[PDB]
Design an enzyme around this catalytic site. Structure first.
Site, PDB file in Angstrom:
ATOM      1  N   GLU A 139       0.804  -1.242   0.000  1.00  0.00           N
ATOM      2  CA  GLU A 139       0.000   0.000   0.000  1.00  0.00           C
ATOM      3  C   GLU A 139       0.837   1.293   0.000  1.00  0.00           C
ATOM      4  O   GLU A 139       0.782   2.066   0.963  1.00  0.00           O
ATOM      5  CB  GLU A 139      -0.982  -0.030   1.195  1.00  0.00           C
ATOM      6  CG  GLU A 139      -1.990  -1.162   1.071  1.00  0.00           C
ATOM      7  CD  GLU A 139      -3.077  -1.166   2.161  1.00  0.00           C
ATOM      8  OE1 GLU A 139      -3.110  -0.231   3.001  1.00  0.00           O
ATOM      9  OE2 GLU A 139      -3.923  -2.088   2.161  1.00  0.00           O
ATOM     10  N   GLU A 228      -4.508  -8.769  -0.736  1.00  0.00           N
ATOM     11  CA  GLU A 228      -4.954  -8.539   0.641  1.00  0.00           C
ATOM     12  C   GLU A 228      -6.328  -7.907   0.679  1.00  0.00           C
ATOM     13  O   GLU A 228      -6.569  -6.908  -0.008  1.00  0.00           O
ATOM     14  CB  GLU A 228      -3.975  -7.601   1.371  1.00  0.00           C
ATOM     15  CG  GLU A 228      -4.304  -7.459   2.879  1.00  0.00           C
ATOM     16  CD  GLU A 228      -3.652  -6.249   3.562  1.00  0.00           C
ATOM     17  OE1 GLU A 228      -2.448  -5.951   3.342  1.00  0.00           O
ATOM     18  OE2 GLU A 228      -4.362  -5.590   4.377  1.00  0.00           O
TER      19      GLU A 228
END
Ligand code: NA
EC number: 3.2.1.136
Length: 397
Positions: A139, A228
């Site tokens: 991220e 994820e």
């Protein structure tokens, strides 16, 4: 009711598998018993075929991943790794839109960072784990608590440094499949050549944003992975809520059919809102994942099927190893009869397993295929996985 048509010759994406995250430091390692439950594919086991682990910024902590990673490999699961921060000597603060606490990799430490990632791959190799792939950054576009990268910083690393990594490279793992993070890679032939897997998360991503036309245009020969998520929420002690847990099978269905994803990886394996409860048993959310994980094995190929034949009914289908697998979700409060028409694939017998408010992956009665179709009832608020045994077995002998 409308038919479902499954066309065995109309191939979609090759499936790498399904699984979840282990994080010893943050969540506590899986125990020996829990590793069996996660990666074995027997009764009361999840059959996870992918494990994600993290690359610690401190190399003196890498040994903590080894035991769980070895158990995944023993069970035939593939293992990949994502980093959250470079070693702290490579990190600097900078002014991110008025936030002076924001951290990034120093521009002159890109080679050192690539070397750190390659050293992790080597460490795992030396501990009997051949890592399938490794990510540039978890991220980079939601990095308040870790390390930020702009789309242009990711691009420079993918061009100049990612080719040095002796493993498949995953990038850029946007938190929400924001295409601005990955477009520059797809649009740059040098960077693209150094990417093996385009990974993303799906936190808050709407289904209308699961497709990615630029990847269809430019991504030939590359893998597409959902690395994820948790879904629909991380509410404490939510994992057995019914029919809420059915939202998990629907989310995987959408990832498979709308996203054409080749891997679907949950966040922590063992957690009160995860597939394995803290007591080490499988949650309703876990059984929803297992409807895919236990049956759609690595190397199976998704195939064309009528995806939404009736209100609240969702269907996907896969083939591999002389079998056709159909996952059919009924999110209504009415049991319905559903006809499954098979094209280009002769079969006779169908086995099924059902998860419902009071039953977990429990066998239903056998069905018979006659004239290339079979009727099956889909109970109210349930998911069924059918396994169709084919008649025409090729390869050798
Ligand atoms: Na490469």
């Amino acid at each position: 009711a409308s038919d479902v048509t499954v066309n065995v010759s109309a191939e979609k994406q090759v499936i790498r598998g399904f699984g979840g995250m282990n994080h010893p430091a943050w969540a506590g390692d899986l125990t020996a018993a829990q590793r069996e439950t996660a990666f074995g594919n027997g009764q009361n086991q999840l059959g996870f075929s992918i494990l994600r682990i993290h690359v610690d910024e401190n190399r003196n902590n890498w040994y903590k991943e080894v035991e769980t990673a070895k158990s995944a490999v023993k069970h035939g699961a593939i293992v990949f790794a994502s980093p959250w921060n470079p070693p702290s000597d490579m990190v600097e603060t900078f002014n991110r839109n008025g936030d002076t606490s924001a951290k990034r990799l120093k521009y002159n430490k890109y080679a050192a960072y690539a070397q750190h990632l390659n050293d992790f791959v080597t460490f795992m190799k030396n501990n009997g784990v051949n890592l399938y792939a490794i990510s540039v950054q978890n991220e980079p576009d939601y990095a308040h608590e870790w390390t930020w990268w702009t789309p242009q910083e990711i691009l420079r690393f993918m061009r100049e440094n990612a080719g040095s990594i002796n493993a498949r490279v995953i990038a850029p793992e946007s938190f929400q499949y924001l295409k601005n993070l990955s477009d520059p890679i797809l649009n740059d032939p040098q960077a693209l050549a150094n990417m093996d897997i385009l990974g993303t998360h799906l936190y808050g991503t709407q289904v209308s944003q699961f497709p990615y036309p630029l990847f269809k245009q430019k991504g030939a020969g590359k893998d597409l992975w959902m690395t994820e998520v948790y879904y629909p929420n991380s509410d404490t002690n939510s994992a057995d809520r019914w029919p809420e847990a059915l939202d998990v099978s629907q989310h995987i269905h959408n990832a498979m059919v709308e996203g054409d994803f080749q891997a679907y990886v949950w966040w922590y394996i063992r957690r009160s809102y995860g597939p394995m409860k803290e007591d080490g048993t499988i949650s309703k959310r876990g059984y929803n994942m297992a409807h895919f994980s236990k049956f759609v094995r690595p190397g199976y190929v998704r195939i064309d099927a009528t995806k939404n034949p009736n209100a609240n009914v969702y269907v996907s289908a896969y083939k591999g190893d002389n079998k056709v697998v159909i996952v059919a979700i009924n999110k209504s409060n009415t049991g319905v009869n559903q006809n499954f028409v098979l094209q280009n694939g002769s079969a006779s017998n169908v086995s099924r397993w059902i998860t419902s408010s009071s039953s977990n992956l429990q066998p239903g009665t056998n069905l018979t295929v006659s004239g290339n179709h079979f009727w099956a009832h889909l109970p109210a608020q349930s998911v069924t996985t059918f396994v169709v045994n084919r008649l025409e077995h090729h390869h050798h002998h």
